[PDB]
Amino acid sequence: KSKLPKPVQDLIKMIFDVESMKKAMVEYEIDLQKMPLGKLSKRQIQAAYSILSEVQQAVSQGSSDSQILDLSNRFYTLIPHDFGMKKPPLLNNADSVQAKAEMLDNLLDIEVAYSLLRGGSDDSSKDPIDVNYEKLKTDIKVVDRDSEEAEIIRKYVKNTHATTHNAYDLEVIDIFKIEREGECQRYKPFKQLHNRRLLWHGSRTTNFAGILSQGLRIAPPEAPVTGYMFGKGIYFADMVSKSANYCHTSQGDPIGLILLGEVALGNMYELKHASHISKLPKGKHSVKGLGKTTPDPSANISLDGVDVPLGTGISSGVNDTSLLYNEYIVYDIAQVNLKYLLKLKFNFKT
Ligand SMILES: CCC(CC)N1CCN(C(=O)c2cc(Cn3c(=O)[nH]c(=O)c4ccccc43)ccc2F)CC1=O
């Protein structure tokens, strides 16, 4: 029977729940009868990535729209869906390709979690919570609610909830201090880079067994670079509600998980519109998507030598931008050092 703190036990139970994995796939309208969770495979997901890349190439290189029709149907054969009586969305425009790329990103970490679960060694004299905790290769400690860490983090949550994201209120349930094995050594070449910032990264709960196991990762080479607004990198935000929207919580599942990561941004290539890149020009270390609203810079606080942009939202004065709020993208996984994991309750306004 596990000795782990009860909040950590609840976390392990949440991120390894198999039925949550199936619910996520059903939410995507994937046919569970034809393609069960156990038949989901990494090379199958990579093959689906390549079809999206084929669609990307066929659209831009001026091929037949007829081929694009066939590539779309091939995607729905490779990944069986079940839209009941409705017509499955056609894969012929960037809008549809980006939605399927997002779906494959989620399937990729679901496969990592399920394979983690069904692998390794097993011992019936051990609590499955203890076994699954050790499979994450991550030290997880509860942050004291009255500590100054929690104070700064709660202030960060309190001040950076955008007015536009008015559908819900956020309530911090647990603050976890996490150390992924090996990630600190991997981050060492970037530890002294300038412009280090503590930024948010939200994701579906079904992704976090893979995120704690493997870290935040760049989409595989088969993934289409045009499937993501700023290409294939790791995305962060400085508004907690922007990243909280990527938790994709609902009134049925109102508990979300959000990361605080130390990100070495260096020289930021500042952009106002989409730019589908996989690498940066020499002398640039990150992309900053310029939003119309930014945390007030005069209110930046230092936490363990890292900037925390917890200022309240003010106009950035940035002219023509497709972004309401800022985005930060790095294109090297060694530029990220995950520090905290928050468990939030979404209180939806009605
Ligand atoms: C988790 C599965 C794996 C699969 C390899 N994965 C997926 C890709 N990825 C990203 O960071 C990533 C995220 C978004 C969307 N987005 C988000 O989801 N949360 C945020 O807070 C956020 C904040 C600002 C902007 C976008 C955000 C788009 C493109 C990306 F590349 C790293 C990663 O590891």
**Is the CATH code 3.90.228.10 the one for domain 137-349?**
yes
Cα 234 to ligand 1 centroid, rounded to whole Å: 6
207 lines ligand 1 (CB under 6 A): yes
Are 150 and 340 in contact by the 8 Å Cβ rule? The answer is no
246 lines ligand 1 (CB under 6 A): yes
Torsion, Cα 63 66 69 71, to 10 degrees, reads -50
112 lines ligand 1 (CB under 6 A): no
CA dist., res. 235 & res. 250, Å (int): 22
Sheet of strand 138-142: strand arrangement: 138-142, 168-180, 336-348, 255-264, 196-203, 306-308, 301-303
Sheet of strand 268-271: strand arrangement: 234-236, 327-330, 286-289, 268-271
**Dihedrals phi, psi of 73, to nearest 5 degrees:** -65, -35
DSSP secondary structure letter of residue 338: E
Positions marked active-site? 327
Common-topology check for domains 1-136 and 137-349: no
Please state the residue numbers annotated as binding site for NAD(+). Answer: 201-203, 210, 217, 243
The first and second tokens of residue 269, run together, are 């290539």
Cα angle: 160, vertex 302, 246; to 5 degrees: 35
Structure determination method: X-ray
Pick the CATH number of 1-136 from 3.40.50.620, 1.10.1660.10, 3.40.50.150, 1.20.142.10: 1.20.142.10
Q: What is the 3-state secondary structure (H, E, C) of 165-223?
A: CCCEEEEEEEEEEEEECCHHHHHHHHCCCCCEEEEEEEECHHHHHHHHHHCCCCCCCCC
The first and second tokens of residue 253, run together, are 């599942």
The first and second tokens of residue 41, run together, are 């495979």
User: What are the extents of the domains in the chain?
Assistant: 1-136, 137-349
| DSSP bridge pairs for 157 | none
Please state the residue numbers annotated as binding site. Answer: 201-203, 210, 217, 243
Sort 290 into a burial class: Cβ within 10 Å, 0-12 / 13-18 / 19+: buried
